[PDB]
Every structure is written in structure tokens, then in C-alpha cells.
Amino acid sequence: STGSATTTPIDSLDDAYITPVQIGTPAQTLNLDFDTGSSDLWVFSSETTASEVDGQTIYTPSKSTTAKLLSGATWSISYGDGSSSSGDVYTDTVSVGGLTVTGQAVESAKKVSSSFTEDSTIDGLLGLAFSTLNTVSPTQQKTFFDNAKASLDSPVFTADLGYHAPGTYNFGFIDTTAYTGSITYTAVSTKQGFWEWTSTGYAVGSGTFKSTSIDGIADTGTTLLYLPATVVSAYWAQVSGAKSSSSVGGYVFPCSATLPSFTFGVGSARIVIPGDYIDFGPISTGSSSCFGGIQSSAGIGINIFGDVALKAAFVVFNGATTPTLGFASK
């Protein structure tokens, strides 16, 4: 089997991407944030505290003939941005882009933090990291991808995120028309439950490539590119007036600037992030200070190849027995 679904930016900054997902019988379609940095499929639901729901579409298990309470199971998750959610668990039929899993754990939110409530466009998350990170207790549950894997033509999914435009998540096949040149594959460590890999270095603009190992995670659920302070300082030094602002929470730059590109290495290959992808616009409406899309990972504890980096590439998440990641230009 295979699946193919379009993923769409939630706003004009590509802050996140939503993908329609069918849950239950008859189908209830919710727009979920596919997150390769976590491993829970959770939704706003008929159980979510009413004051914490503001415009989201909810899953109502009592209206699904295939929903079953997973008795005694609870879940609770906290994300790197400080947001969180928790609740109980149903199993139900879940379909993405024509690919159906029966018996998928659908985590029903009883509580969500403010950032989720305030984002009316995101109806929940669909985790695509390794199932060892799944938070369901006392019986850990599998991700949609892990459940689908045996049925897939090939044990892979791909992320093809757009810049200010829709893109695609495919399951079970590699669309050879969706990228240019060749795909370069690189080793993954699953020790921390993430799609963790080592970039071979970077360049700023037209500058020389610096060969240096940068361990980090491929994370579709993180907006920006978070890299070591040395690397980030080298980038922003090439932008007149750019500075790190503790009051704002990172690097800002004059909105009149033209940003240089940023290149990262994948083995001997190179992925180029255009300068425009690094512009996250005014820090507040009407401001001439703009927020940067490359930020320091210092104090996160991990480097994160988020959407800024991933949307510059066609990315293969290879879930074979020995997992790997592939990157191609597009």
C-alpha cells in the first residue's frame, strides 16, 4: 500500500504545516501537524476542556462506530517550545492520503496548553519519530508509520515541504519526479528516539564550505533551524545590523536586509537554503526589526533541522531495519 497527502502552511510565514487526516467511521477529517520530532497522535476532541477549544475541529469518538476506549491508558506530553497536552486514548481507524491503519491509538486531549488553544488551524499532532518516545501509559503505543510499515510497498515516508506553498507527505514510495539529481542517504541514530543524523558542515552565502560534524534531528514539527552558536554567529555576521536580542528571544535583523543563503552538508552533497527562507518577518506588526530563521541551539541541548532546512529539500525517512535519512535538492 501507499498514501499521499498534501500538506499546507498554516500561515504566511510557514510557521507549521497541516495535513488532513481521516479518523473514525464515518470519517472525521482533522488537520494535523505531522511531527517527525514526536511520537504521539493526539487530537482536540469532545473531551477537551471547553475553555481550551477555540476554532479547532474536534474528534468525537462517540460518533465513530469503530472507536474503542483503550481502557486505563493515559498520555501526557511536553514539547520543546514549552507547550503541552494530555488526556486518554481510543483506538480507531486512521487514514492519511488513502493509506489506512486500523487499531491506531488516537490520543484524545482533555487538556491543552495556551499555544494550542490559540492556534485555530491545528487540530492535533501526528507523530512520526520512533515509537519509543510515545507517551501512552501503561502500555506504550505505536505511531501511524510504525503501524502502517508492514503494509507499505517500501518502509519509508517522505517530506516535501513547500516554501510559502503546499507540499506533500508520501508513505510507502519515493516519488522520483519530486526532486532533482540524486538522493544522498546518511546514517540515523535512534538512541534518543529521533531521526538523528550528522551533517558534514555548512557554508554561509557564497563562502567556503566548513567541514565539521553537526549532530541534529530532522524535525518537521519545529519551524526554524537551530544550530550551534558558532555556526549561527558566523551566519548573522554576514548581515549588516543583525544581532541577538535577549528581549526578543533570538537573532533579529533589519527588515531592509537581503539575507545570504545557508548551505548544509549531507555526506558529500549540499543542500542550499535560500536567504528568503530565513526571513520570518517583523517581530511585531509594523516593526522594521525582522526575526531570523536560523537560531542558536545553545540551551536546547540538541541541534534541530526544522522546517527552514527541510523545506529546501526532498527528505526520505527510511524506516527499514537500519533506518537512514535521504536528502535531495528539488
mmCIF file with all atom_site columns, C-alpha atoms in Angstrom, residues 6-217:
data_model
loop_
_atom_site.group_PDB
_atom_site.id
_atom_site.type_symbol
_atom_site.label_atom_id
_atom_site.label_alt_id
_atom_site.label_comp_id
_atom_site.label_asym_id
_atom_site.label_entity_id
_atom_site.label_seq_id
_atom_site.pdbx_PDB_ins_code
_atom_site.Cartn_x
_atom_site.Cartn_y
_atom_site.Cartn_z
_atom_site.occupancy
_atom_site.B_iso_or_equiv
_atom_site.pdbx_formal_charge
_atom_site.auth_seq_id
_atom_site.auth_comp_id
_atom_site.auth_asym_id
_atom_site.auth_atom_id
_atom_site.pdbx_PDB_model_num
ATOM 1   C CA . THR A 1 6   ? -0.894  17.394 0.611   1.00 0.00 ? 6   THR A CA 1
ATOM 2   C CA . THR A 1 7   ? 0.478   19.458 3.479   1.00 0.00 ? 7   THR A CA 1
ATOM 3   C CA . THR A 1 8   ? -0.317  23.187 3.664   1.00 0.00 ? 8   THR A CA 1
ATOM 4   C CA . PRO A 1 9   ? 1.322   26.053 5.584   1.00 0.00 ? 9   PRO A CA 1
ATOM 5   C CA . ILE A 1 10  ? -0.900  27.368 8.384   1.00 0.00 ? 10  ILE A CA 1
ATOM 6   C CA . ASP A 1 11  ? 0.046   30.997 7.759   1.00 0.00 ? 11  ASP A CA 1
ATOM 7   C CA . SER A 1 12  ? 2.103   33.322 5.584   1.00 0.00 ? 12  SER A CA 1
ATOM 8   C CA . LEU A 1 13  ? 5.319   32.542 7.489   1.00 0.00 ? 13  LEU A CA 1
ATOM 9   C CA . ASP A 1 14  ? 5.215   28.743 7.141   1.00 0.00 ? 14  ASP A CA 1
ATOM 10  C CA . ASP A 1 15  ? 5.068   28.514 10.948  1.00 0.00 ? 15  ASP A CA 1
ATOM 11  C CA . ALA A 1 16  ? 3.774   24.959 10.633  1.00 0.00 ? 16  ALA A CA 1
ATOM 12  C CA . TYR A 1 17  ? 2.085   22.693 8.104   1.00 0.00 ? 17  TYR A CA 1
ATOM 13  C CA . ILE A 1 18  ? -1.250  20.890 8.360   1.00 0.00 ? 18  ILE A CA 1
ATOM 14  C CA . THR A 1 19  ? -2.257  17.678 6.637   1.00 0.00 ? 19  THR A CA 1
ATOM 15  C CA . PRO A 1 20  ? -5.823  16.324 6.512   1.00 0.00 ? 20  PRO A CA 1
ATOM 16  C CA . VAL A 1 21  ? -6.313  13.030 8.339   1.00 0.00 ? 21  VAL A CA 1
ATOM 17  C CA . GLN A 1 22  ? -9.445  10.857 8.366   1.00 0.00 ? 22  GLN A CA 1
ATOM 18  C CA . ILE A 1 23  ? -10.328 9.382  11.762  1.00 0.00 ? 23  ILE A CA 1
ATOM 19  C CA . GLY A 1 24  ? -13.191 7.043  12.570  1.00 0.00 ? 24  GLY A CA 1
ATOM 20  C CA . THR A 1 25  ? -16.275 5.739  10.805  1.00 0.00 ? 25  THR A CA 1
ATOM 21  C CA . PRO A 1 26  ? -17.827 7.682  9.181   1.00 0.00 ? 26  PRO A CA 1
ATOM 22  C CA . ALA A 1 27  ? -14.656 9.676  8.626   1.00 0.00 ? 27  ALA A CA 1
ATOM 23  C CA . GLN A 1 28  ? -13.970 12.738 10.740  1.00 0.00 ? 28  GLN A CA 1
ATOM 24  C CA . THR A 1 29  ? -11.355 14.841 8.964   1.00 0.00 ? 29  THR A CA 1
ATOM 25  C CA . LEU A 1 30  ? -8.962  16.759 11.199  1.00 0.00 ? 30  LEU A CA 1
ATOM 26  C CA . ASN A 1 31  ? -5.985  18.849 10.093  1.00 0.00 ? 31  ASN A CA 1
ATOM 27  C CA . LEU A 1 32  ? -2.941  17.549 11.924  1.00 0.00 ? 32  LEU A CA 1
ATOM 28  C CA . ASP A 1 33  ? 0.626   18.787 12.303  1.00 0.00 ? 33  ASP A CA 1
ATOM 29  C CA . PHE A 1 34  ? 2.866   15.929 11.157  1.00 0.00 ? 34  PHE A CA 1
ATOM 30  C CA . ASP A 1 35  ? 5.806   15.961 13.543  1.00 0.00 ? 35  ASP A CA 1
ATOM 31  C CA . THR A 1 36  ? 8.919   13.860 12.924  1.00 0.00 ? 36  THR A CA 1
ATOM 32  C CA . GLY A 1 37  ? 10.158  15.053 16.356  1.00 0.00 ? 37  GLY A CA 1
ATOM 33  C CA . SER A 1 38  ? 7.497   13.322 18.451  1.00 0.00 ? 38  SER A CA 1
ATOM 34  C CA . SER A 1 39  ? 5.581   10.069 18.549  1.00 0.00 ? 39  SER A CA 1
ATOM 35  C CA . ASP A 1 40  ? 2.014   10.744 19.743  1.00 0.00 ? 40  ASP A CA 1
ATOM 36  C CA . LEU A 1 41  ? -1.048  11.116 17.518  1.00 0.00 ? 41  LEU A CA 1
ATOM 37  C CA . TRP A 1 42  ? -3.277  13.375 19.593  1.00 0.00 ? 42  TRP A CA 1
ATOM 38  C CA . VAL A 1 43  ? -6.358  15.378 18.740  1.00 0.00 ? 43  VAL A CA 1
ATOM 39  C CA . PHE A 1 44  ? -8.679  18.038 20.007  1.00 0.00 ? 44  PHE A CA 1
ATOM 40  C CA . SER A 1 45  ? -11.815 16.143 20.929  1.00 0.00 ? 45  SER A CA 1
ATOM 41  C CA . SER A 1 46  ? -15.254 16.158 22.522  1.00 0.00 ? 46  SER A CA 1
ATOM 42  C CA . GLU A 1 47  ? -13.333 15.535 25.770  1.00 0.00 ? 47  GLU A CA 1
ATOM 43  C CA . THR A 1 48  ? -11.168 18.660 25.551  1.00 0.00 ? 48  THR A CA 1
ATOM 44  C CA . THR A 1 49  ? -11.842 21.237 28.284  1.00 0.00 ? 49  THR A CA 1
ATOM 45  C CA . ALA A 1 50  ? -14.307 23.581 26.585  1.00 0.00 ? 50  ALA A CA 1
ATOM 46  C CA . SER A 1 51  ? -12.466 26.791 27.518  1.00 0.00 ? 51  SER A CA 1
ATOM 47  C CA . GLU A 1 52  ? -9.342  25.407 25.803  1.00 0.00 ? 52  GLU A CA 1
ATOM 48  C CA . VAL A 1 53  ? -11.035 24.906 22.424  1.00 0.00 ? 53  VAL A CA 1
ATOM 49  C CA . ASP A 1 54  ? -11.111 27.954 20.099  1.00 0.00 ? 54  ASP A CA 1
ATOM 50  C CA . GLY A 1 55  ? -11.983 27.147 16.498  1.00 0.00 ? 55  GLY A CA 1
ATOM 51  C CA . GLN A 1 56  ? -10.388 23.701 16.138  1.00 0.00 ? 56  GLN A CA 1
ATOM 52  C CA . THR A 1 57  ? -12.229 20.777 14.605  1.00 0.00 ? 57  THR A CA 1
ATOM 53  C CA . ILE A 1 58  ? -12.718 18.072 17.225  1.00 0.00 ? 58  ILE A CA 1
ATOM 54  C CA . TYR A 1 59  ? -12.779 14.284 17.108  1.00 0.00 ? 59  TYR A CA 1
ATOM 55  C CA . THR A 1 60  ? -15.908 12.847 18.728  1.00 0.00 ? 60  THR A CA 1
ATOM 56  C CA . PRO A 1 61  ? -15.294 9.166  19.442  1.00 0.00 ? 61  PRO A CA 1
ATOM 57  C CA . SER A 1 62  ? -18.939 8.529  20.387  1.00 0.00 ? 62  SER A CA 1
ATOM 58  C CA . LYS A 1 63  ? -19.838 9.283  16.738  1.00 0.00 ? 63  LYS A CA 1
ATOM 59  C CA . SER A 1 64  ? -17.391 6.704  15.358  1.00 0.00 ? 64  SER A CA 1
ATOM 60  C CA . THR A 1 65  ? -18.609 3.136  15.061  1.00 0.00 ? 65  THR A CA 1
ATOM 61  C CA . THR A 1 66  ? -15.011 1.900  15.060  1.00 0.00 ? 66  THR A CA 1
ATOM 62  C CA . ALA A 1 67  ? -13.777 3.839  18.121  1.00 0.00 ? 67  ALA A CA 1
ATOM 63  C CA . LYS A 1 68  ? -12.951 1.868  21.259  1.00 0.00 ? 68  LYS A CA 1
ATOM 64  C CA . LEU A 1 69  ? -11.712 3.255  24.563  1.00 0.00 ? 69  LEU A CA 1
ATOM 65  C CA . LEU A 1 70  ? -8.237  1.923  25.348  1.00 0.00 ? 70  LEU A CA 1
ATOM 66  C CA . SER A 1 71  ? -9.157  1.252  28.935  1.00 0.00 ? 71  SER A CA 1
ATOM 67  C CA . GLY A 1 72  ? -6.826  2.684  31.561  1.00 0.00 ? 72  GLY A CA 1
ATOM 68  C CA . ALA A 1 73  ? -4.472  4.359  29.099  1.00 0.00 ? 73  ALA A CA 1
ATOM 69  C CA . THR A 1 74  ? -3.449  7.981  29.576  1.00 0.00 ? 74  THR A CA 1
ATOM 70  C CA . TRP A 1 75  ? -0.929  10.252 27.903  1.00 0.00 ? 75  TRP A CA 1
ATOM 71  C CA . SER A 1 76  ? 0.863   13.493 28.658  1.00 0.00 ? 76  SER A CA 1
ATOM 72  C CA . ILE A 1 77  ? 3.402   15.298 26.525  1.00 0.00 ? 77  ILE A CA 1
ATOM 73  C CA . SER A 1 78  ? 5.545   18.402 26.727  1.00 0.00 ? 78  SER A CA 1
ATOM 74  C CA . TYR A 1 79  ? 7.207   19.856 23.650  1.00 0.00 ? 79  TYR A CA 1
ATOM 75  C CA . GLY A 1 80  ? 10.453  21.769 23.202  1.00 0.00 ? 80  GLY A CA 1
ATOM 76  C CA . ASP A 1 81  ? 8.604   25.072 22.918  1.00 0.00 ? 81  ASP A CA 1
ATOM 77  C CA . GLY A 1 82  ? 7.058   24.574 26.360  1.00 0.00 ? 82  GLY A CA 1
ATOM 78  C CA . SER A 1 83  ? 3.611   23.625 25.077  1.00 0.00 ? 83  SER A CA 1
ATOM 79  C CA . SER A 1 84  ? 1.820   20.531 26.354  1.00 0.00 ? 84  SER A CA 1
ATOM 80  C CA . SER A 1 85  ? -1.289  18.384 26.228  1.00 0.00 ? 85  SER A CA 1
ATOM 81  C CA . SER A 1 86  ? -2.704  15.302 27.941  1.00 0.00 ? 86  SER A CA 1
ATOM 82  C CA . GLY A 1 87  ? -5.701  13.018 28.046  1.00 0.00 ? 87  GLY A CA 1
ATOM 83  C CA . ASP A 1 88  ? -6.931  9.470  27.470  1.00 0.00 ? 88  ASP A CA 1
ATOM 84  C CA . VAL A 1 89  ? -6.829  7.109  24.476  1.00 0.00 ? 89  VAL A CA 1
ATOM 85  C CA . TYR A 1 90  ? -9.071  5.480  21.907  1.00 0.00 ? 90  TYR A CA 1
ATOM 86  C CA . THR A 1 91  ? -8.220  3.083  19.127  1.00 0.00 ? 91  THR A CA 1
ATOM 87  C CA . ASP A 1 92  ? -9.815  3.848  15.785  1.00 0.00 ? 92  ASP A CA 1
ATOM 88  C CA . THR A 1 93  ? -9.267  3.654  12.032  1.00 0.00 ? 93  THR A CA 1
ATOM 89  C CA . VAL A 1 94  ? -6.972  6.384  10.733  1.00 0.00 ? 94  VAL A CA 1
ATOM 90  C CA . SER A 1 95  ? -6.306  7.165  7.082   1.00 0.00 ? 95  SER A CA 1
ATOM 91  C CA . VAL A 1 96  ? -3.740  9.504  5.548   1.00 0.00 ? 96  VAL A CA 1
ATOM 92  C CA . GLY A 1 97  ? -3.826  10.169 1.836   1.00 0.00 ? 97  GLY A CA 1
ATOM 93  C CA . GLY A 1 98  ? -5.569  6.878  1.105   1.00 0.00 ? 98  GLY A CA 1
ATOM 94  C CA . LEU A 1 99  ? -3.418  4.759  3.446   1.00 0.00 ? 99  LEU A CA 1
ATOM 95  C CA . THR A 1 100 ? -5.472  3.179  6.226   1.00 0.00 ? 100 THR A CA 1
ATOM 96  C CA . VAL A 1 101 ? -4.394  1.840  9.619   1.00 0.00 ? 101 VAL A CA 1
ATOM 97  C CA . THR A 1 102 ? -6.892  0.025  11.799  1.00 0.00 ? 102 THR A CA 1
ATOM 98  C CA . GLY A 1 103 ? -6.434  -0.029 15.559  1.00 0.00 ? 103 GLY A CA 1
ATOM 99  C CA . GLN A 1 104 ? -4.394  3.188  15.660  1.00 0.00 ? 104 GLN A CA 1
ATOM 100 C CA . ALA A 1 105 ? -4.034  4.819  19.074  1.00 0.00 ? 105 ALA A CA 1
ATOM 101 C CA . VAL A 1 106 ? -5.803  8.174  18.853  1.00 0.00 ? 106 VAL A CA 1
ATOM 102 C CA . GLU A 1 107 ? -4.927  10.204 21.922  1.00 0.00 ? 107 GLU A CA 1
ATOM 103 C CA . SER A 1 108 ? -7.861  12.371 22.962  1.00 0.00 ? 108 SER A CA 1
ATOM 104 C CA . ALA A 1 109 ? -6.899  15.632 24.651  1.00 0.00 ? 109 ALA A CA 1
ATOM 105 C CA . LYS A 1 110 ? -8.582  16.520 27.897  1.00 0.00 ? 110 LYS A CA 1
ATOM 106 C CA . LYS A 1 111 ? -6.223  19.474 28.368  1.00 0.00 ? 111 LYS A CA 1
ATOM 107 C CA . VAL A 1 112 ? -4.066  21.512 26.012  1.00 0.00 ? 112 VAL A CA 1
ATOM 108 C CA . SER A 1 113 ? -1.790  24.451 26.750  1.00 0.00 ? 113 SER A CA 1
ATOM 109 C CA . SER A 1 114 ? -2.466  28.002 25.613  1.00 0.00 ? 114 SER A CA 1
ATOM 110 C CA . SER A 1 115 ? -0.387  27.867 22.424  1.00 0.00 ? 115 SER A CA 1
ATOM 111 C CA . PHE A 1 116 ? -2.543  25.028 21.107  1.00 0.00 ? 116 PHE A CA 1
ATOM 112 C CA . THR A 1 117 ? -5.810  26.765 22.019  1.00 0.00 ? 117 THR A CA 1
ATOM 113 C CA . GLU A 1 118 ? -4.631  29.947 20.309  1.00 0.00 ? 118 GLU A CA 1
ATOM 114 C CA . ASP A 1 119 ? -3.806  28.156 17.073  1.00 0.00 ? 119 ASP A CA 1
ATOM 115 C CA . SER A 1 120 ? -7.190  27.546 15.480  1.00 0.00 ? 120 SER A CA 1
ATOM 116 C CA . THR A 1 121 ? -5.654  25.889 12.409  1.00 0.00 ? 121 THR A CA 1
ATOM 117 C CA . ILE A 1 122 ? -4.067  22.874 14.141  1.00 0.00 ? 122 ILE A CA 1
ATOM 118 C CA . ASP A 1 123 ? -6.479  20.151 15.265  1.00 0.00 ? 123 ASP A CA 1
ATOM 119 C CA . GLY A 1 124 ? -3.734  17.957 16.749  1.00 0.00 ? 124 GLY A CA 1
ATOM 120 C CA . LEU A 1 125 ? -0.395  16.309 16.031  1.00 0.00 ? 125 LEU A CA 1
ATOM 121 C CA . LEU A 1 126 ? 0.613   13.151 14.221  1.00 0.00 ? 126 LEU A CA 1
ATOM 122 C CA . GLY A 1 127 ? 3.969   11.960 15.498  1.00 0.00 ? 127 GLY A CA 1
ATOM 123 C CA . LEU A 1 128 ? 6.455   10.367 13.114  1.00 0.00 ? 128 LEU A CA 1
ATOM 124 C CA . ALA A 1 129 ? 9.513   9.907  15.347  1.00 0.00 ? 129 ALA A CA 1
ATOM 125 C CA . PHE A 1 130 ? 10.275  6.462  16.781  1.00 0.00 ? 130 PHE A CA 1
ATOM 126 C CA . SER A 1 131 ? 7.615   4.753  18.869  1.00 0.00 ? 131 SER A CA 1
ATOM 127 C CA . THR A 1 132 ? 9.979   4.545  21.861  1.00 0.00 ? 132 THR A CA 1
ATOM 128 C CA . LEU A 1 133 ? 9.059   8.218  22.508  1.00 0.00 ? 133 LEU A CA 1
ATOM 129 C CA . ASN A 1 134 ? 5.312   7.583  22.642  1.00 0.00 ? 134 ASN A CA 1
ATOM 130 C CA . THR A 1 135 ? 3.905   8.816  25.978  1.00 0.00 ? 135 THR A CA 1
ATOM 131 C CA . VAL A 1 136 ? 0.930   6.470  26.451  1.00 0.00 ? 136 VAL A CA 1
ATOM 132 C CA . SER A 1 137 ? 0.946   4.729  29.822  1.00 0.00 ? 137 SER A CA 1
ATOM 133 C CA . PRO A 1 138 ? 0.937   1.988  31.000  1.00 0.00 ? 138 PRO A CA 1
ATOM 134 C CA . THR A 1 139 ? 1.098   0.418  27.524  1.00 0.00 ? 139 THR A CA 1
ATOM 135 C CA . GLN A 1 140 ? 3.181   2.426  25.045  1.00 0.00 ? 140 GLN A CA 1
ATOM 136 C CA . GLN A 1 141 ? 1.590   2.790  21.617  1.00 0.00 ? 141 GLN A CA 1
ATOM 137 C CA . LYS A 1 142 ? 2.926   2.761  18.064  1.00 0.00 ? 142 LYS A CA 1
ATOM 138 C CA . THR A 1 143 ? 2.983   5.643  15.624  1.00 0.00 ? 143 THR A CA 1
ATOM 139 C CA . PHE A 1 144 ? 0.872   5.698  12.486  1.00 0.00 ? 144 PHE A CA 1
ATOM 140 C CA . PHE A 1 145 ? 4.008   4.968  10.439  1.00 0.00 ? 145 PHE A CA 1
ATOM 141 C CA . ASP A 1 146 ? 5.042   2.036  12.598  1.00 0.00 ? 146 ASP A CA 1
ATOM 142 C CA . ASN A 1 147 ? 1.566   0.533  12.349  1.00 0.00 ? 147 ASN A CA 1
ATOM 143 C CA . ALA A 1 148 ? 1.470   1.065  8.569   1.00 0.00 ? 148 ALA A CA 1
ATOM 144 C CA . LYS A 1 149 ? 5.001   -0.144 7.888   1.00 0.00 ? 149 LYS A CA 1
ATOM 145 C CA . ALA A 1 150 ? 4.397   -3.830 7.191   1.00 0.00 ? 150 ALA A CA 1
ATOM 146 C CA . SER A 1 151 ? 1.669   -2.994 4.678   1.00 0.00 ? 151 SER A CA 1
ATOM 147 C CA . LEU A 1 152 ? 3.698   -0.367 2.822   1.00 0.00 ? 152 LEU A CA 1
ATOM 148 C CA . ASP A 1 153 ? 5.303   -1.108 -0.534  1.00 0.00 ? 153 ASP A CA 1
ATOM 149 C CA . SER A 1 154 ? 8.562   0.215  0.960   1.00 0.00 ? 154 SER A CA 1
ATOM 150 C CA . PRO A 1 155 ? 9.110   1.076  4.650   1.00 0.00 ? 155 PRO A CA 1
ATOM 151 C CA . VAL A 1 156 ? 9.546   4.802  4.062   1.00 0.00 ? 156 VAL A CA 1
ATOM 152 C CA . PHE A 1 157 ? 7.818   8.134  4.185   1.00 0.00 ? 157 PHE A CA 1
ATOM 153 C CA . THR A 1 158 ? 8.914   11.365 2.531   1.00 0.00 ? 158 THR A CA 1
ATOM 154 C CA . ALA A 1 159 ? 8.525   15.021 3.450   1.00 0.00 ? 159 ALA A CA 1
ATOM 155 C CA . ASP A 1 160 ? 8.383   17.570 0.643   1.00 0.00 ? 160 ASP A CA 1
ATOM 156 C CA . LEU A 1 161 ? 7.540   20.838 2.378   1.00 0.00 ? 161 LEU A CA 1
ATOM 157 C CA . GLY A 1 162 ? 6.834   23.968 0.366   1.00 0.00 ? 162 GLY A CA 1
ATOM 158 C CA . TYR A 1 163 ? 8.164   27.477 0.795   1.00 0.00 ? 163 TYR A CA 1
ATOM 159 C CA . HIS A 1 164 ? 5.050   29.632 1.095   1.00 0.00 ? 164 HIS A CA 1
ATOM 160 C CA . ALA A 1 165 ? 3.226   26.863 -0.790  1.00 0.00 ? 165 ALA A CA 1
ATOM 161 C CA . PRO A 1 166 ? 1.701   23.417 -0.261  1.00 0.00 ? 166 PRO A CA 1
ATOM 162 C CA . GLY A 1 167 ? 3.826   20.283 -0.349  1.00 0.00 ? 167 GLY A CA 1
ATOM 163 C CA . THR A 1 168 ? 3.432   16.549 0.128   1.00 0.00 ? 168 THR A CA 1
ATOM 164 C CA . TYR A 1 169 ? 3.835   13.706 2.601   1.00 0.00 ? 169 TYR A CA 1
ATOM 165 C CA . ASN A 1 170 ? 4.088   10.319 0.876   1.00 0.00 ? 170 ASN A CA 1
ATOM 166 C CA . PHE A 1 171 ? 4.021   6.918  2.580   1.00 0.00 ? 171 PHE A CA 1
ATOM 167 C CA . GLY A 1 172 ? 5.426   3.743  1.103   1.00 0.00 ? 172 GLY A CA 1
ATOM 168 C CA . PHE A 1 173 ? 7.118   5.077  -2.040  1.00 0.00 ? 173 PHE A CA 1
ATOM 169 C CA . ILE A 1 174 ? 9.669   7.584  -3.277  1.00 0.00 ? 174 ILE A CA 1
ATOM 170 C CA . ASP A 1 175 ? 8.312   9.909  -5.987  1.00 0.00 ? 175 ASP A CA 1
ATOM 171 C CA . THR A 1 176 ? 11.249  10.154 -8.385  1.00 0.00 ? 176 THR A CA 1
ATOM 172 C CA . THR A 1 177 ? 9.611   13.160 -10.095 1.00 0.00 ? 177 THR A CA 1
ATOM 173 C CA . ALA A 1 178 ? 9.632   15.240 -6.898  1.00 0.00 ? 178 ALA A CA 1
ATOM 174 C CA . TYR A 1 179 ? 13.366  16.005 -6.703  1.00 0.00 ? 179 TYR A CA 1
ATOM 175 C CA . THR A 1 180 ? 16.321  16.868 -8.887  1.00 0.00 ? 180 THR A CA 1
ATOM 176 C CA . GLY A 1 181 ? 19.610  15.000 -9.075  1.00 0.00 ? 181 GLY A CA 1
ATOM 177 C CA . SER A 1 182 ? 20.211  12.123 -6.682  1.00 0.00 ? 182 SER A CA 1
ATOM 178 C CA . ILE A 1 183 ? 19.166  11.411 -3.098  1.00 0.00 ? 183 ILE A CA 1
ATOM 179 C CA . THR A 1 184 ? 22.080  11.245 -0.658  1.00 0.00 ? 184 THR A CA 1
ATOM 180 C CA . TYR A 1 185 ? 21.492  8.915  2.263   1.00 0.00 ? 185 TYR A CA 1
ATOM 181 C CA . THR A 1 186 ? 23.059  9.310  5.676   1.00 0.00 ? 186 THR A CA 1
ATOM 182 C CA . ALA A 1 187 ? 23.079  7.235  8.875   1.00 0.00 ? 187 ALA A CA 1
ATOM 183 C CA . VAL A 1 188 ? 20.487  7.667  11.611  1.00 0.00 ? 188 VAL A CA 1
ATOM 184 C CA . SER A 1 189 ? 20.826  7.067  15.328  1.00 0.00 ? 189 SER A CA 1
ATOM 185 C CA . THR A 1 190 ? 17.598  6.108  17.059  1.00 0.00 ? 190 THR A CA 1
ATOM 186 C CA . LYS A 1 191 ? 19.187  6.183  20.523  1.00 0.00 ? 191 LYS A CA 1
ATOM 187 C CA . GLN A 1 192 ? 17.192  9.263  21.582  1.00 0.00 ? 192 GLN A CA 1
ATOM 188 C CA . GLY A 1 193 ? 14.065  8.263  19.617  1.00 0.00 ? 193 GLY A CA 1
ATOM 189 C CA . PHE A 1 194 ? 14.586  10.888 16.925  1.00 0.00 ? 194 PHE A CA 1
ATOM 190 C CA . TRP A 1 195 ? 15.605  10.936 13.280  1.00 0.00 ? 195 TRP A CA 1
ATOM 191 C CA . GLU A 1 196 ? 19.076  11.949 14.427  1.00 0.00 ? 196 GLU A CA 1
ATOM 192 C CA . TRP A 1 197 ? 21.888  12.322 11.914  1.00 0.00 ? 197 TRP A CA 1
ATOM 193 C CA . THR A 1 198 ? 25.197  14.138 11.407  1.00 0.00 ? 198 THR A CA 1
ATOM 194 C CA . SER A 1 199 ? 25.576  16.917 8.863   1.00 0.00 ? 199 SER A CA 1
ATOM 195 C CA . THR A 1 200 ? 29.026  17.225 7.347   1.00 0.00 ? 200 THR A CA 1
ATOM 196 C CA . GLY A 1 201 ? 29.262  21.020 7.564   1.00 0.00 ? 201 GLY A CA 1
ATOM 197 C CA . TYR A 1 202 ? 27.999  24.356 6.331   1.00 0.00 ? 202 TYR A CA 1
ATOM 198 C CA . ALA A 1 203 ? 28.591  27.448 4.241   1.00 0.00 ? 203 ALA A CA 1
ATOM 199 C CA . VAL A 1 204 ? 27.237  30.976 4.524   1.00 0.00 ? 204 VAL A CA 1
ATOM 200 C CA . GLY A 1 205 ? 26.226  32.582 1.247   1.00 0.00 ? 205 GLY A CA 1
ATOM 201 C CA . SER A 1 206 ? 28.936  32.207 -1.364  1.00 0.00 ? 206 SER A CA 1
ATOM 202 C CA . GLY A 1 207 ? 31.538  31.479 1.325   1.00 0.00 ? 207 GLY A CA 1
ATOM 203 C CA . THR A 1 208 ? 33.771  28.456 1.584   1.00 0.00 ? 208 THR A CA 1
ATOM 204 C CA . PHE A 1 209 ? 32.313  25.250 2.987   1.00 0.00 ? 209 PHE A CA 1
ATOM 205 C CA . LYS A 1 210 ? 33.377  24.446 6.545   1.00 0.00 ? 210 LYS A CA 1
ATOM 206 C CA . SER A 1 211 ? 33.758  20.710 7.100   1.00 0.00 ? 211 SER A CA 1
ATOM 207 C CA . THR A 1 212 ? 32.510  19.982 10.599  1.00 0.00 ? 212 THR A CA 1
ATOM 208 C CA . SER A 1 213 ? 30.226  17.349 12.110  1.00 0.00 ? 213 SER A CA 1
ATOM 209 C CA . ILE A 1 214 ? 26.869  18.704 13.296  1.00 0.00 ? 214 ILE A CA 1
ATOM 210 C CA . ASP A 1 215 ? 24.646  16.162 15.029  1.00 0.00 ? 215 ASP A CA 1
ATOM 211 C CA . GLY A 1 216 ? 20.979  17.059 14.927  1.00 0.00 ? 216 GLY A CA 1
ATOM 212 C CA . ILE A 1 217 ? 17.417  15.898 14.303  1.00 0.00 ? 217 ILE A CA 1
#
